[PDB]
Amino acid sequence: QYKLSVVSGGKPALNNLSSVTGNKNIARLSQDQRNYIIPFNNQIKVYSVETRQCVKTLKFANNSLLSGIFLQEEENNESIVKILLGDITVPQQAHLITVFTNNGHVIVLNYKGKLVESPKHFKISLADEKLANVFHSEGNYRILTTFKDNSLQSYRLYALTFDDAKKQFEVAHQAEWHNVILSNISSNGKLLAHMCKDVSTKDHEHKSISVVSLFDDSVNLSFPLGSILSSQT
Amino acid sequence: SPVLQSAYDPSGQYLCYVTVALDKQRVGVQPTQRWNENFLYLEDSKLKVTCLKWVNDTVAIILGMNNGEIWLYSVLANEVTYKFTTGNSYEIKDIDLMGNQLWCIDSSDAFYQFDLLQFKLLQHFRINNCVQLNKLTIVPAGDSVAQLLVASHSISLIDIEEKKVVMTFPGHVSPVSTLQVITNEFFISGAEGDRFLNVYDIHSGMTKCVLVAESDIKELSHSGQADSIAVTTEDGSLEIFVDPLVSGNKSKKSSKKIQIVSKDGRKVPIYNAFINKDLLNVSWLQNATMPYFKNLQWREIPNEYTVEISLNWNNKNKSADRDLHGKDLASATNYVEGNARVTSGDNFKHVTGTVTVILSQALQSNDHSLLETVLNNRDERVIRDTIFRLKPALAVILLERLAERIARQTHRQGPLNVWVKWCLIIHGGYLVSIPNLMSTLSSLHSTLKRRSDLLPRLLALDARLDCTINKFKTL
Amino acid sequence: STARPRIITSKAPLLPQQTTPEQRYWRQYTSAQLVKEHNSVTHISFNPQHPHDFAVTSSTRVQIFSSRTRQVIKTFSRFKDVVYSASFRSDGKLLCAGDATGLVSVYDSYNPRTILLSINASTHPTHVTKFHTQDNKILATASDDRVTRLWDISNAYEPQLELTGATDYVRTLSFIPAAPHLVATGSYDGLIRLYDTRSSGSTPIYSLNHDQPVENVIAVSPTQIVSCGGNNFKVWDLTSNKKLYERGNFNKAVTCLDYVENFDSPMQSALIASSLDGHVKVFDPLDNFQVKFGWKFSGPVLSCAVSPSTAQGNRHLVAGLSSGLLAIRTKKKKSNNFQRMMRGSEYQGDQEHIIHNDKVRSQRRMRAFERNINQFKWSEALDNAFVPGMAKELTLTVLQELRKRGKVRVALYGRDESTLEPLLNWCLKGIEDVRSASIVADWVAVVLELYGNTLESSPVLQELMIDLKTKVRHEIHKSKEAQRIEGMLQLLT
Amino acid sequence: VLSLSFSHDGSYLLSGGWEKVMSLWQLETNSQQFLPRLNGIIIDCQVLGPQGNYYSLILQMTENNSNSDYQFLLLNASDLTSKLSINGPLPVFNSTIKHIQQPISAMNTKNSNSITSLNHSKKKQSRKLIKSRRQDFTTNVEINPINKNLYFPHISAVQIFDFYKNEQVNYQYLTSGVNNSMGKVRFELNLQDPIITDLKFTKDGQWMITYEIEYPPNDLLSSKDLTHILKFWTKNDNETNWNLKTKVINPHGISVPITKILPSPRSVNNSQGCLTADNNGGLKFWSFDSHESNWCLKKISLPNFNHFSNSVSLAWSQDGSLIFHGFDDKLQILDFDTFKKFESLENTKTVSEFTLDSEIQTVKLINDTNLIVATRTTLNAINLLRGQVINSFDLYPFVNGVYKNGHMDRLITCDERTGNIALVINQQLTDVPTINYKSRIIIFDSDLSTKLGNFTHHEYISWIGWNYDTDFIFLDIESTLGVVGT
Amino acid sequence: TLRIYHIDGKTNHLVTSLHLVGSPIQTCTFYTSLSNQNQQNIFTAGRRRYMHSWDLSQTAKIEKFSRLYGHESTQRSFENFKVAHLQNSQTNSVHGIVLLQGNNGWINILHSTSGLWLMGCKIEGVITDFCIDYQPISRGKFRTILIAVNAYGEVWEFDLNKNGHVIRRWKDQGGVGITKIQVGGGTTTTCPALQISKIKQNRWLAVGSESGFVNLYDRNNAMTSSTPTPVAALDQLTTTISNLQFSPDGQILCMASRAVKDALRLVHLPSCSVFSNWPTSGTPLGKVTSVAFSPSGGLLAVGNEQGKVRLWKLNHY
């Protein structure tokens, strides 16, 4: 007689677990500036940018794979970390969306219509240290992952390629850095900056900043916040 | 009217219209069933489309233009496929087609027959005693194509293999505009700037009847078996004749009339509507060139009817982000009070030398100036003598007046602090007897309660004061 | 983004006798001007049709005054002795005056140089004269002969009706606006009688007793009337034939009473009564004739009046005193080439398709304290809070706003004694006030807790403190006596 | 500062700091443009349009110290207007729930932490959740029935929400605060906005009753009084913003809380009145004046009890004849005609002074016959026509000391047509009470005749009511709103 | 009021009519983004501090630029402004810019779509006019040039490809007080292009002014001279010069004066020859106040004081 069901969702799914990136605004706008995709704690909402009202909803409970992945009643570990407009597999399909959660899941879905209850599900390899971020220039993809061994955290950088097989997500293991206190990535997604405490160990000042290019090695520079700072401070 | 030429397709699903834009004519096709931004432009500003015929395998249109040639233009490919030229620099005047046969009148009074499948001029041709001509049709004689009609203000039927005229119908005073064979032996002719359609019977060579519009007849269409004829009228309207081929019987008026009006009163014209059995389709120009469409059932619609259409005539530009007034929608509206009344939780509502005679008179007629002048005094013996020789209820209302004056001017309460004391002293028993003490001294109670509430913080201030006082007096 | 919220003025708890919309409106009755005549003005009456004028009686003299000008517009002096009554017609053309000769004179307004009609009443001097309201051509009068006379214009030489049935000194009579035939009459015996003109008339239909001498009878409503005589006044109802109410809140005998209804006002109907003190009091029938307002003028008023409902302009209220003092309280209500070059701005957009507007209205101009506080110059805002020329309540409001939003310390870090005193002068001015004492205590306590030893260094601030101690001990005594007040009130309840 | 962003060119700097302002730093002349009032501090900023057309930004809404209330905003570069605003419902919890951490600032305040302060506060919050047993998180939530509109009484504000479309329709300020009139800065963070503790609506739905308490700045002599304010407003169905009409300063005297509020039904005065219960047992009944546009103190029962205990509640007989008053260790029934004791001439021991074991939290009549009372240790269902008890159940094993007074009142409600529905909260523990909460919602009927239905929920639930569509609405710690219905 | 019409010979009809309140229409222009080819914005300004931008169906999408991220003190109003393309030249992205006068020399340069304060260049004396030149550099690239004319007669050429730097100087021979300037002969404001490859350097340059001259220079030789001699010094207008516009193909130049009725001259180039047969005395033209050419069809639109606009066709094209 009396049945229970969730109706309304609030809190957007902010990647508060990272707490190292200054760019955690993950909800993204389409290729065409027509609609906005926003991942909440329990659903993903799509809004036409002009009428301002909700034009599509993607409820995890109503979905099957979303219910079984994101709606775990025992752990809230897995949350969306990235949305991607273009489809990863097919080159230039249009209404596709790629979703990356906390734990190496690649979910390909279609908005703008009826969501098929058979999403393109994939799981990445080397899903031992956590997935912190993912991004891309043309073709090549890049993954930032949070790795651990002083309450400080290392960051491993890999290059992602695909289309070898349906499961074959090739990882290049580009590089790695340690005990990064703060890090960020350029809006172009071609450069990143981060700090550390190795210079704290090797000097008096507690951190130095290093900037690194992603798809090239043009910019690879380290320098001390001691040089940066002032006598007055 | 901005639409230079228009023409429907069979089955009434699409129409192609040629219209001008910066003196270059562009043709555009649209579907009328529910845009198509694809057009086709003309390179030369001087050559224009004269006649425009639909053709059903790829769906194509035939464009007889000023240059004297015919352009076969495939619409889905959106391109001019073929150009039939003739041996002249003239302007083709009217086109017609059936099967693989095509026929046309060139304004040089020259007939031309073309074959589509062979993409070739089958025959040049000329006929005597046809001096001006601007319409032709070919009778539905089955697959045979003989005995076709030509018309310019005088309809002449001519045989092709006999290549000579047969019968001569009296045409009109003006040049003929529309000429259509409804059924065998019956056809309609409608002149230019005229209101009369002639219904002619062929084999008789005689006039079956005449249909009268309401204004000049711009365009005409008809259903399959002479049951319905709809004419678009120049001042912009649709007049439909129903069963116009059956029995002061020679001329038939319109059977039904249809107009289009916007919300505010402005009347939108109609142009080139299409009729099918129990279905009427209506086209109009929504924006300066954009055509819009509607469908309806003439059988059910009454004999006079006005399609209403909503236009943003004086529309208010509503934007999703600006509110009704001043602020944006995402702006969390602030807090205001306006003229809201304030009330506390202690204001209860809906719960010898005496001056006695002056007090009583002032209380009986509450003169504020007189009461002020009589309360100016401060002699305690006079206070006691007054309140002794004062009435109880008069002293009660006096106490109320004292309360309201202490509230208005708390500075006045200094000498006034003993008036209330003497009142209570000399008329306590009447206050014991009265039932509603709060109801009769609420104002007094508020004043004294706020004074008592002032008391403790005031004494704390006094302690801080004399602390620092003695502090800097000794140092 | 949001707008900047306007400063929220702090509203005090309601004080007794709150300013009603009524009391406010009876305060915008303004512009009280006094003019002097040479005897006791007897009767005052406005012109119904175009209420722009009113007529006042005086010594052998009838004066017509305007509304915008409020000046003597027309002069009537063709009387032999002092006039007694003046009344306009419903058509606003004829004014009729009852004199002391027992012959009334009625003639058109704005033509004093014509005696359009002189009707001879009884030999005894005629007292009161009135037109009909519903009827255009019937007049009523009462003289010292204790008989009232109904007069038609056609028979100026013989009274159309001779109404009798009174006791002594007939002095008032009135017409019911509903019945065009019923009449009320008040004599010196109270006991207002009620006659019918279409009947015989000589006997009243019925009378209602006003024991003390009734001097006014006013048909306030189609069903209710007021008998205004002696100290009190009784509002009766004719259908019930009994007094609905009565008010005796007047000091001496009430001398005049009028009524106004369905005019531009928060109160729908108003009833004015003047009681020989300059004391005019405004009641209202919809509130069972409850006290609504009052004015007092030193000279004992003899007549009062108010501008009618349809005055189409400035409202007027007159009080004529027995000294001959009319007190009128009035409430008052580039060349062709350039035009051609900017001749389009007046379009306002009536015909085109789509209308759009993003204008923002110009709010109230922003005061100095608000400006300084919003741009955060806190010490300067304090200085403006203690400039001399402004309101105590405004200073109060700015003090609470400052102490709430900011902290009084930061508003109060680095002053000298020279900018210190004005705060304390405002303190000595307003500590005695109930509403602000706690706030002033807060501010003085923190200012001393910061500037302890500077109090010693600066000599003048010390005696400022001394007088502060004296006055706050005075308030100590006041508050403790208030606590004693608590005591015996709790005893008496 | 919180967010730094660069233009695609590199000549504009988007800065968002603690104060609610967005700064455009034009690098060359080092100029700036300001957005000064954004309803919450701004954590993050970003440029989206390939030409730089849209400014996205993440807003913290940290005024709610319990709940870090996030909001996403998107701006036209053209007009700098809030092109798009998304925001979930913002409950006001009694404590921080799982990991809500005050953002970094210069000094640790009631809304902010320093760095060592941040780490110490993290460890302290973890130890508090591990040790303490008082995890209530009960939030006051109201429902306008005339519009089925959810109302969240946020700190010095109200959030009007509609669960049907899951959107916030309004955010209205009510207190003379400095929430939007000015930011908050390093030292002023210790100053807090007024807390609108109470908000309900009349059964008419046109009038909303609000009670708030004022907090003077610290380190003052007058920094001790908690000024209590009542307010009545009005809104129609053709608008969405309430307009204040009546405003009452310190009812029942100074510094006296007015904790318990109960509206009047349409039966007595067309629901134009309200009843207020203090810890001093004072019960004041106001109602709207006919001729005059304000309310007034129609009736008053003013006891003066030396002791004080905010465990006070009242229930209203559907006909308005009597009022139940649950006072600490006492039940009262007051006649409404005179605010005196329920005197019965027949003397059939239907007395109005009922002793109870603990402080009474709730007293609710399901009809004019059945009354359920929930005291701090148990619950009891009794009859009204006859003074006979029917049912009883325990709260010591479960409701022992988790909550303070009034939290049961704001949790448990009653529907006049299906019965009563209660709430209970448990937590799964692995060897330490694990933070994972796990509650139950139980539906009864007719003074607990039987359990209509028990349903366990794997997570915490902080509020339950019933939408008049005969469907009870429950909340989670995250802003998820669910329903039990037929 | 903004009214947009659709243009034919026999039928010009009202496509749309928007009405602003309290924002007079002193200038208003179409504009297309070159890259996307689907913006189709409209920009409008008057005797106010705010300029409306309308995008391109029953509700309008109209923004207003009113905040200048650098400074509001350089210009009292927006009554005059222009619109142009601009290539970043670092990232090969092309977008619109908006150009504004100020009080003394100030010329503000804003990003059209976003409303940013891109840069500014100050010209001395009193600004009287400015114009926009384009210059193809190689395939797929060009640079934009802003020409400013001071009242005295000085002309200052800035480039905008790199940030604002004076390309050069030169003074007009004569022209004591100039009123308007205008380049023409190729891709320009009244003759916009439709892709990168279609941009061609203008050829003719006109400097017109109130004592009625119009000095016409040829770019090909002025650029090398730096003290140029006008190819011609036209004087057929006795009164103030208020509208100078070139034909889309740079063969005809129209000169229009606001003061006197019937104040339009057309000049054929390079003949520098005023056309004699038009306008005649009986050419109903009114007190001319606005003129514009067609992109292709050689149409001519001219609006007068009485509010009427008239439309001729240059039959040759």
Tell me if chain D has a CB within 8 Å of the CB of B324.
Answer: no
Say if residues C192 and C184 touch (Cβ distance below 8 Å): yes
- Tokens representing B375? 């309360």
DSSP D389-446: EEEEEE-SSSSSSS--TTHHHHH-EEETTTEEEEEEEEE-------S-EEEEEEE--T
Closest CA to C320 of C291, C346, C299: C299
Say if residues C86 and C43 touch (Cβ distance below 8 Å): yes
Rounded CA-CA distance A195/A206 in Å is: 10
Rounded CA-CA distance C134/C149 in Å is: 18
Q: Is residue B83 exposed (0-12), middle (13-18) or buried (19+ Cβ within 10 Å)?
A: middle
Rounded CA-CA distance C88/C107 in Å is: 10
- Tokens representing D51? 């030409």
Q: Where are the beta strands (DSSP E) in D36-163?
A: 42-47, 54-59, 71-76, 82-86, 142-144, 149-152, 157-162
- Tokens representing D455? 């349903």
| DSSP 8-state secondary structure symbol assigned to residue B67 | T
Q: How far is residue E176 from each of residues B226, E128, E129, E151, E171, measured CA to CA in Å?
A: 81, 12, 14, 7, 10
Closest CA to D91 of C313, A8, A117: A8
Say if residues B62 and B81 touch (Cβ distance below 8 Å): no
Say if residues A212 and A191 touch (Cβ distance below 8 Å): yes
- Tokens representing C79? 């009387």
DSSP D336-380: TTTTEE---TT--S--SEE--SS-EEEEEESSSSEEEEEETTEEE
Type of residue at B321: D
Rounded CA-CA distance C469/C447 in Å is: 15
How many CA atoms lie less than 13 Å away from B344 in the CB half-sphere?
21
Say if residues C171 and C185 touch (Cβ distance below 8 Å): no
Give the phi and the psi of residue E33 in degrees, each rounded to 5.
Answer: -70, 140
Q: Is the dihedral of CA C103, C109, C113, C117 positive or negative?
A: negative
Say if residues D56 and D76 touch (Cβ distance below 8 Å): no
Rounded CA-CA distance A5/A12 in Å is: 20
Is C359's CB within 8 Å of E24's CB?
Answer: no
**Quick one: which H or E segment has residue B103?**
strand B101-106
Spell out a b/e string for C367-381, using b for 16 or more CB atoms within 10 Å of the CB, else e.
Answer: eebbebbeeeebebb
DSSP chain A: --EEEEEE--SB---TTT-SBS-----EE-SSTTEEEEEBSSEEEEEETTT-SEEEEEETTTSSHHHHHH--SS-----EEEEESS-SSSS----EEEEEESSSEEEEEE-SSPPPSS-EEEE-S--SSEEEEEEESSS-EEEEEEE------EEEEEEEE--SSSS--EE---EEE---S-EEE-TTSSEEEEE-SHHHHHSSSS-EEEEEESSSSS-EEEEEHHHHS-S--
Q: Residue C33 CB: number of other CB atoms within 10 A?
A: 11
The CB-based long-range contact list for B97-101 (8 Å cut-off, 24+ gap) reads B97/B53, B97/B55, B97/B62, B98/B138, B98/B145, B99/B143, B101/B138, B101/B145
Q: What is the largest CA-CA distance in chain D?
A: 92
Q: How far is residue B134 from each of residues B93, B151, D290, D453, E279, measured CA to CA in Å?
A: 5, 6, 85, 87, 40
Q: Do chains E and C touch (3 or more CB pairs under 8 A)?
A: yes
Which strands make up the sheet holding B92-98, listed edge to edge?
Answer: B92-98, B101-106, B110-115, B120-126
Say if residues C100 and C81 touch (Cβ distance below 8 Å): yes
Say if residues A87 and A93 touch (Cβ distance below 8 Å): yes
Rounded CA-CA distance C164/B445 in Å is: 59
Contacts of E21 in chain C (CB under 8 A): 348-349, 355-357, 359
* Mutation for B interface: E13, E16, E37, most B CBs within 10 A: E13
| DSSP 8-state secondary structure symbol assigned to residue D111 | S
3-state secondary structure of C470: helix
The alpha carbon of residue E98 and the mean position of all alpha carbons in its chain are separated, in whole angstroms, by 12
Closest CA to E255 of E247, E263, E246, E244: E244
CA–CA min distance A51, chain B (Å): 7
Q: Residue D360 CB: number of other CB atoms within 10 A?
A: 28
**Bridge pairing between strands C126-131 and C182-187:** unpaired
Range list of H helices, B341-436: 356-364, 368-375, 380-388, 392-408, 413-416, 419-426, 428-433
Q: Residue D370 CB: number of other CB atoms within 10 A?
A: 23
The CB-based long-range contact list for C423-430 (8 Å cut-off, 24+ gap) reads C423/C382, C423/C386, C423/C447, C424/C461, C424/C464, C424/C468, C425/C386, C426/C386, C426/C395, C427/C468, C428/C464, C428/C467, C428/C468, C428/C471, C429/C392, C430/C392, C430/C395, C430/C396
What number of residues does chain E have?
317
- CA dihedral angle for residue B157, residue B163, residue B165, residue B167, rounded to 10 degrees: -50
- CA dihedral angle for residue E220, residue E224, residue E225, residue E230, rounded to 10 degrees: 10
Closest CA to C254 of C234, C274, C236: C274
DSSP D176-241: S-STTTS---TTGGGS---EEEEEEE-TTSS-EEEEEE----SSSTTSS---EEEEEEE--TT-SS
Tell me if chain B has a CB within 8 Å of the CB of A52.
Answer: yes
Beta-bridge partners for C44: C56
Q: Do chains D and A touch (3 or more CB pairs under 8 A)?
A: yes
CA–CA min distance B19, chain E (Å): 9
Give the phi and the psi of residue C403 in degrees, each rounded to 5.
Answer: -65, -30
- What angle do the packed helices B419-426 and B392-408 form, to 10 degrees? 160
**Quick one: which H or E segment has residue C24?**
helix C21-28
Rounded CA-CA distance A51/D83 in Å is: 10
What number of residues does chain A have?
233
The alpha carbon of residue E161 and the mean position of all alpha carbons in its chain are separated, in whole angstroms, by 19
Say if residues E15 and E5 touch (Cβ distance below 8 Å): yes
Say if residues E227 and E170 touch (Cβ distance below 8 Å): yes
3-state secondary structure of D481: strand
Rounded CA-CA distance D217/D222 in Å is: 9
Say if residues B102 and B86 touch (Cβ distance below 8 Å): no
Q: Peptide bond before E270: cis, by omega within 30 degrees of 0?
A: yes
Q: Do chains A and C touch (3 or more CB pairs under 8 A)?
A: no
**Quick one: which H or E segment has residue B24?**
strand B24-31
Q: Name the closest residue on chain D to residue C449, using Cα atoms.
A: D220
Q: Solved by what technique?
A: cryo-EM
Q: Is residue C389 exposed (0-12), middle (13-18) or buried (19+ Cβ within 10 Å)?
A: exposed
- Tokens representing C154? 């056609």
Q: Is the dihedral of CA C361, C364, C367, C373 positive or negative?
A: negative
Rounded CA-CA distance B219/B283 in Å is: 12
Say if residues C80 and C115 touch (Cβ distance below 8 Å): no
CA–CA min distance B327, chain A (Å): 17
Spell out a b/e string for E158-191, using b for 16 or more CB atoms within 10 Å of the CB, else e.
Answer: bbbbeeeeebeebebeebeebbbbbbbbbbbbbb
What number of residues does chain B have?
475
Q: How far is residue E287 from each of residues E208, E236, E263, measured CA to CA in Å?
A: 18, 17, 7
Q: Residue C246 CB: number of other CB atoms within 10 A?
A: 14
Partner residue facing D84 (CB), from A7, A41, A47: A47
- Tokens representing E193? 């292009």
Say if residues E284 and E273 touch (Cβ distance below 8 Å): no
Say if residues B394 and B363 touch (Cβ distance below 8 Å): yes
Q: After which residues is chain B broken (C to N over 2.5 A)?
A: 34, 56, 247, 351
* Residues from E in contact with D at Cβ < 8 Å: 53, 63-65, 67, 69-71, 88, 91, 93, 95, 111, 113-117, 119
The alpha carbon of residue D209 and the mean position of all alpha carbons in its chain are separated, in whole angstroms, by 13
Say if residues C96 and C62 touch (Cβ distance below 8 Å): no
The 3-state secondary structure of chain E, one letter per residue = CEEEEECCCCCCEEEEEEEECCCCCCEEEEECCCCCCCCCEEEEECCCCCEEEECCCCCCCEEEECCCCCCCCCCCCCCCEEEEEEECCCCCCEEEEEEECCCCCEEEEEECCCCCEEEEEECCCCEEEEEEEEEEEECCEEEEEEEEEECCCEEEEEECCCCCEEEEEEECCCCCCCCEEEEECCCCCCCCCCCHHHCCCCCEEEEECCCCCEEEEEHHHHHHHCCCCCCEEECCCCCCCCEEEECCCCCEEEEECCCCCCCEEEEECCCCEECCCCCCCCCCCCCEEEEEECCCCCEEEEEECCCCEEEEECCCC
3-state secondary structure of B170: coil
Rounded CA-CA distance B427/B398 in Å is: 12
Partner residue facing D173 (CB), from B334, B341, B460: B334
* Mutation for D interface: B321, B323, B335, most D CBs within 10 A: B335
Rounded CA-CA distance E188/E82 in Å is: 11
Rounded CA-CA distance D57/D55 in Å is: 6
Rounded CA-CA distance C314/E221 in Å is: 80
Rounded CA-CA distance D147/D237 in Å is: 8
Give the phi and the psi of residue D296 in degrees, each rounded to 5.
Answer: -160, 170
Contacts of C344 in chain E (CB under 8 A): 24
Rounded CA-CA distance D277/D260 in Å is: 5
Rounded CA-CA distance A199/A196 in Å is: 7
What number of residues does chain D have?
486
Contacts of D307 (CB under 8 A, 6+ apart): none
Contacts of B142 (CB under 8 A, 6+ apart): none
Say if residues C177 and C133 touch (Cβ distance below 8 Å): yes
Q: Residue D80 CB: number of other CB atoms within 10 A?
A: 21
What number of residues does chain C have?
493
Closest CA to C265 of C2, C33, C67, C27: C27
Rounded CA-CA distance C467/C469 in Å is: 5
Spell out a b/e string for C309-318, using b for 16 or more CB atoms within 10 Å of the CB, else e.
Answer: eebeebbbbb
Is D483's CB within 8 Å of A25's CB?
Answer: no
The terminus-to-terminus CA distance of chain E in angstroms comes to 32
DSSP C386-439: T-SSS-HHHHHHHHHHHHHHS-HHHHTSS--HHHHHHHHHHHHHHTTSTTTHHH
Rounded CA-CA distance D157/D166 in Å is: 19
Is D483's CB within 8 Å of A7's CB?
Answer: yes
Type of residue at D422: A
Q: How far is residue D239 from each of residues C129, D243, E299, measured CA to CA in Å?
A: 59, 10, 53
Say if residues C146 and C171 touch (Cβ distance below 8 Å): no
Q: Is residue C168 exposed (0-12), middle (13-18) or buried (19+ Cβ within 10 Å)?
A: exposed
**Bridge pairing between strands C44-46 and C53-58:** antiparallel
Q: How far is residue D272 from each of residues B221, B344, D268, D269, D299, measured CA to CA in Å?
A: 69, 19, 9, 6, 14
- Tokens representing C263? 């005019």
Partner residue facing C353 (CB), from E16, E22, E62: E16
Contacts of D173 in chain C (CB under 8 A): 5
**Bridge pairing between strands C354-356 and E13-20:** parallel
The CB-based long-range contact list for C283-287 (8 Å cut-off, 24+ gap) reads C283/C247, C285/C220, C285/C221, C285/C224, C285/C235, C285/C259
Is B331's CB within 8 Å of D175's CB?
Answer: no
